[PDB]
């Protein structure tokens, strides 16, 4: 045998020892999953809700911009629908982590918007399109409106993008916790603590509380080190919540005022161009519920021992090898800590 220390005879072979080891693995995984389930479901719920809510906000803002174009500038439709749809598509693509340039979104928006304004509103009556696109930026026809929108939307979209990435990475690490594979020595110690009493012919004897403590503090020496980074993660997320609905929803008013501004100088512009050519409540409740789990990694061995069958009195208990009257007395964790450090730096910088 390689696990069950044979003091007398034994009622179990090597294959039964392997079966007990696999059942020990399954029991540890089930206990960790039961410890992590409440927090996992909380973060999954909130991640799903925030993702759907941001998509709803983007769709509604695109709808409102399209509706205000339909009502106030019918001469710019249906071209207006194309560039508005492209703009808000790129908005959503940026929110969901794709490589999109915010300044380029706004600049392509105004580049597409100016030629149809000139041809349908200012000078009524395809090849000259690029000359108009160049004149848009060369003559600064929209004034400071493009840079105003650029900063207004970049500031909110970056915090939203990093909020979603932080929620997803929290889900990732919490899913990793209950799937943390342990050392072989810990496998054998857990097998001894939970099952090796059956090999000695005992039916209902439980392991000592102190033996459970030494075993758990033995194989969770790495997992407990995650607690500092998890606390910093929680506090940095709290720093970040203290934004994007208001901006995307006022975009239509800002664009309308920019169109008025360009129409204001039409006299000189046409001649020159003719010559030349409940959310805040949700994030607050989320942070207040997330602060209740700041001790998650430090209380984990206590959970494993308090939810495993143990003799708390340390009397007539199993010490891993014999029935006593009184008890005598990294790689995946490294990846978790790496990702936590990364997301914590990213969080703190948006502050």
């Amino acid at each position: 045998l390689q696990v069950c220390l044979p003091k007398g005879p034994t009622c179990c072979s090597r294959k039964m020892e392997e079966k007990y080891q696999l059942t020990a693995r399954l029991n540890m995984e089930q206990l960790l999953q039961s410890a992590s389930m409440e927090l996992k479901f909380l973060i999954i719920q909130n991640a799903a809700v925030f993702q759907e809510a941001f998509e709803i906000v983007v769709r509604h803002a695109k709808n409102y911009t399209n509706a205000m174009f339909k009502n106030n500038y019918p001469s710019l439709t249906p071209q207006a629908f194309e560039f508005v749809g492209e703009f808000f598509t790129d908005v959503s693509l940026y929110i969901l982590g794709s490589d999109i340039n915010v300044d380029d979104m706004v600049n392509e928006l105004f580049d597409s918007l100016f030629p149809v304004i000139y041809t349908q509103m200012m000078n009524p009556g395809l090849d000259i399109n690029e000359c108009l696109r160049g004149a848009r930026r060369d003559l600064k026809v929209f004034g400071s409106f493009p840079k105003l929108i650029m900063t207004q939307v970049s500031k909110s979209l970056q915090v939203t993008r990093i909020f979603l990435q932080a929620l997803n990475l929290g889900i990732e690490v919490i899913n990793t916790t209950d799937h943390l594979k342990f050392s072989k020595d810990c496998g054998r110690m857990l097998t001894r603590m939970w099952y090796c009493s059956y090999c000695q012919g005992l039916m209902m004897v439980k392991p000592c509380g102190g033996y459970c403590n030494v075993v758990m503090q033995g194989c969770m020496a790495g997992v407990v080190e995650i607690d500092k980074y998890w606390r910093e993660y929680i506090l940095s997320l709290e720093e970040l919540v203290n934004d994007m609905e208001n901006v995307l929803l006022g975009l239509f008013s800002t664009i309308h005022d920019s169109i008025q501004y360009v129409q204001k100088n039409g006299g000189k512009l046409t001649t020159t161009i003719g010559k030349l050519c409940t959310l805040s409540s949700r994030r607050r409740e989320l942070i207040q519920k997330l602060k209740s789990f700041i001790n998650f990694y430090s209380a984990l061995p206590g959970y494993i021992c308090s939810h495993s069958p143990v003799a708390e009195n340390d009397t007539l208990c199993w010490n891993g090898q014999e029935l006593v009257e009184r008890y005598s007395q990294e790689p995946v964790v490294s990846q978790i800590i790496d990702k936590l450090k990364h997301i914590n730096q990213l969080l703190r910088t948006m502050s």
Binding site: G97, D99, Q165, N168, E172, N175, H342
Partner: protein, 41 residues
Amino acid sequence: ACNVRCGRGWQKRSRTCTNPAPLNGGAFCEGMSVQKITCTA
């Protein structure tokens, strides 16, 4: 569970992008995140 007691109901299935979650500008998950089916109670 089907939200409506009698007639056309709904059943949802979520699929998050967390195993692994994109980092340092990783490509996001490809395809749909939610699954919805009509149910008759």
